[PDB]
Design a binder for this molecule. Sequence first.
Ligand SMILES: OC[C@H]1O[C@@H](O)[C@H](O)[C@@H](O)[C@@H]1O
Ligand SMILES: OC[C@H]1O[C@@H](O)[C@H](O)[C@@H](O)[C@@H]1O
Lengths: 302, 302
Amino acid sequence: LTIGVIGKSVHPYWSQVEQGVKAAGKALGVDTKFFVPQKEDINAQLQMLESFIAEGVNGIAIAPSDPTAVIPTIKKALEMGIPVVTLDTDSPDSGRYVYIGTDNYQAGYTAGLIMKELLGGKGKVVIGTGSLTAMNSLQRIQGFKDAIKDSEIEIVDILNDEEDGARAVSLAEAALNAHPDLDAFFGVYAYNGPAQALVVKNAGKVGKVKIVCFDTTPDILQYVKEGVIQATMGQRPYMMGYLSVTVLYLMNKIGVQNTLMMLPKVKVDGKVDYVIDTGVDVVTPENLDEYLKKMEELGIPI
Amino acid sequence: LTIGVIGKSVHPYWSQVEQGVKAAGKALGVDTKFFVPQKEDINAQLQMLESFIAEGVNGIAIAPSDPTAVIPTIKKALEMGIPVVTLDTDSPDSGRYVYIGTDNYQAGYTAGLIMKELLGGKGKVVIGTGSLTAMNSLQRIQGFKDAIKDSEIEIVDILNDEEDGARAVSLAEAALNAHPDLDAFFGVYAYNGPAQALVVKNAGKVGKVKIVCFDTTPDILQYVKEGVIQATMGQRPYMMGYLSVTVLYLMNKIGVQNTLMMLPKVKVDGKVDYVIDTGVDVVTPENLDEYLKKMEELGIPI
Ligand SMILES: OC[C@H]1O[C@@H](O)[C@H](O)[C@@H](O)[C@@H]1O
Ligand SMILES: OC[C@H]1O[C@@H](O)[C@H](O)[C@@H](O)[C@@H]1O
């Protein structure tokens, strides 16, 4: 059997997902194809998707940079008898059987409450994300807004870098100059937190300008350690990759229905959906050490 | 790989469980050992459990007729690296990783609410079960009690047949001739429903005496067709046996933890537990054709 997985960018975050993909494949005796474009690239994801289908893979897990754009192709994959699940970010109307990843809206809400606390309920915030089409970005941002709604905290900007590191840095660097009265940064994607951290450090504003972001890749954790980042919403990319392969494997061996019978279910608009929530680890400078301990203890060290 | 499954009795209900166990094994390439004593026999379950452990199976799924009696042995199995899950009825402190089956307490509550409606909150009811140790029987019973608590309905008898057909019958008709003024019969196990129905149809009480039971085996359904049984809480024995083999298979291939995070979790006494609720189908004479249609569509016809 062969299973194909499609990510959204070349960030180390997707490396963790790939490791999960390969480990699951090795444990189950399955071949895995992994693809991630350099930066956000909807057309490349579509072509790779078209390609995996033509190759006749037995399963596809995809993290859509655009949930609507992939619907027709995902429908074809399903017509061709190839199971499809989403991971990292969802496309609920595509026909994908299961979404596997973080509860994005809530992850953002939590980050919003943390921010609300750090700023004492007031101040100006600039948001940095790598997409304005991916549903996971929109949900994290939406949840952030909903969490600070009952305060005087105002978001003065939402900057999209298309999942490009240099671009994320220069956009945050300019936003800092356009807003010398900025109180905080909110990084929605893995590139954003450490980009805003470099900006703030470069301007000598560590502590002055708060940073609440996502993920726990090396560069981020190092800034959390230096105290530049007060809090980051850590995900479980590895698990997302490992369970995606597993779920698709089962759907081939035991069938789509039997596989769904054993997964967590939720209700959307009075209808049943399937969601495996991989959880978030709220990491701050105070609990960093426990985090490095907890991770290695769970089997995914450093 | 070899998976061992232990049932509670020779009822056709367990044949359904076994078909699932054999279907899963076949689809996954796993050998399956299946055991059920003639009637309730805790000692036989324990003896069979000890042999599967000695024979070094790679997984065990058990439906303990006594949740406490099996703890030391299940613990021994786990100590020796053999994953254990429960199905049909639980043993929450045995150390088993997952419970796969009906939500027994709630299915009982639902059963109680249906009676309460049928009897106008008043009348004499006699419960018929096949165990007073098995947790699924105690939960279904405690649930029936909790549902009709604030009504005038009363339970005059709780007859235990130790999962024996003839005993289910002779115990019933020895309650209808000690209570010819009996309002209703409540069958907890699959043996009970048909027995109670055979009795009631004999004493020409078809309709007079109310019958609310569990399961949808040939006989139970037949009597729902003749309006002898008004409502029966149907389970999914097939799914229980199929998923039990699947879960144990995964635990061997990808590990216990990776498998657990794929399943629905619940919080019990502040600690996370894993439970696959195979759901219940409330069947009445009104929808006895829709139920047949539904089962036919899910791949488990007739
Ligand atoms: O920017 C890299 C990655 O960051 C993560 O936080 C997001 O969940 C991914 O969708 C994104 O591709
Ligand atoms: O008595 C036959 C069977 O009836 C079912 O209702 C119960 O779930 C089983 O535990 C029992 O073995």
